[PDB]
Structures are given as C-alpha cells and as structure tokens.
A and B are shown apart, each in its own frame.
Chain A
Amino acid sequence: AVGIGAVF
C-alpha cells in the first residue's frame, strides 16, 4: 500500500 507502512 502507498498510504501506510508495513507492520512487523
């Protein structure tokens, strides 16, 4: 997604 960063 471009609106939110990846979660870890």
Chain B
Amino acid sequence: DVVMTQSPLSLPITPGQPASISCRSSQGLVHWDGNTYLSWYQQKPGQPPRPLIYQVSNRYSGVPDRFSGSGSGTDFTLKISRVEAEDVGVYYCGQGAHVPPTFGGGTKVEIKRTVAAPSVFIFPPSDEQLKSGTASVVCLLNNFYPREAKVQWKVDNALQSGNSQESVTEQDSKDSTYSLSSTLTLSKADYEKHKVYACEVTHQGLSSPVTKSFNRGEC
C-alpha cells in the first residue's frame, strides 16, 4: 500500500497569510492511463470531504484560486496563497493511482485571531429535570479565543472535583471563536442540600476570573 505522509499535523495561521502543506508518497502515483492521481480535500466538522484538487494541480469547479497544488514524483504541495477564516478545517491528500486508495493523516488548519474574552452564562436545573430525579447545572462560555479556558465549579463555595464534564465547539468559520459548555451533575437530593452554585472562568481575555452564580430557591 502507498504510504501518504502529510506535514505539518497542525497549522495555525492568521487570515491573509500563506499556508503550505506537504504530502509525500512512498511510491510514484502514475496510473496505467498515464495520469498522476494526487488529490487534496478539505473537511469541515460533520461534513464529507470536499475535493479541492485533482491530478496534482487541477482545481475542482468553484474552488477558489487561492488554493493551488503542485509537485511531482513522490513530493507534492498544497498552497493557500492567503488564508481566509472560512478555510478552518482538516485537509487531506490522497492517491488514486494504486489499489488500495490511501490518504494522508490530515493537517488541521486553525485560524489565529485577536484575543476575545468569553461571555459567561449559567443555567440552573429545570423543574422538569428535577421532577425526573437528577440535577444538571450548565455553564456556557461563549465566543472566546484562544481555545484554552478553565472552568471551576463551586457549591456553597466548596471547590468541586470529578462531577462535571466539558465540551468545546469547533472553531467558528466566520469569527474564528470557540464556545464551551460545562455541566455539573448532582443527585437531586445533593442539589437540594446546598444553596449557592457558581461557575468561575479564567481565560487569557479576562484580567480577572469571572464568576456567574445563583442561589437555589432564590431569585
């Protein structure tokens, strides 16, 4: 099988700046029909691969001309002359000259932007969930950059450990920010045992941590 080696694995880049991705094959990629089948694909989260380049250097229809492919033999390059925020995603090379068709491991293109502090919101458990028998407290950190953020849960001002889970969106295609959801999960009995529920957020964009909190049974 043809081994496809892609480099770099991660490519953070400011819009307007150029990017270059290397793909190296372990064999030549010339098919019996005489063509060289090296392709490049763009993939956004939850979407199939979008073919960008076929046969080394040819753009598929509608692909912007800031994407270009070059190379020969076993050495190939995808260049983005000036990256746009909408280019965020994972890029793959692939060969179609030998069975099995094989792909590179992917290059994650991440967009750099100015620091943006999260907006922080907190949601008590709903009455319906409380009727159900458990309590989920949700803390939302909205539209921030860079991706690193720290969330700490406090119950009656006691730091919590091991009872929360986090999820981060992929980088937004328009404003290049991230958002984060943190859920603290308690039994309903434990939830009713305490009063103050707090989500404390630290992030490069905040000169001091931001805490959002509520009192159970209170306004």
Contacts and interface: CB of A to CB of B under 8 A. Distances in A.
Contacts of B101: 4
Contacts of B96: 1, 3-5
Determine which residue in A1, A2, A5, A6 has the highest number of CB atoms from chain B within 10 A of its CB, and name it: A5
The 5 A-B residue pairs whose C-beta atoms are closest, nearest first, are A4-B96, A5-B31, A3-B54, A3-B39, A2-B54
Nearest to A5: B31
B51 A3 contact: yes
By size class, the interface of chain B is: 10 to 19
Interface in B48-72: 51, 54-55, 58
Given A4-B39, A5-B96, A6-B33, 19 more contacts: A1-B96, A2-B54, A2-B55, A2-B58, A3-B39, A3-B51, A3-B54, A3-B55, A3-B96, A4-B37, A4-B96, A4-B101, A5-B31, A5-B32, A5-B33, A5-B35, A5-B37, A5-B97, A7-B99
A7 B37 CA distance: 13
Interface of A: 1-7
B200 to A, nearest CB: 51
Contacts of B31: 5
A1 to B, nearest CB: 8
Determine which residue in A1, A2, A6, A7 has the highest number of CB atoms from chain B within 10 A of its CB, and name it: A2
B212 to A, nearest CB: 50
A2 B51 CA distance: 11
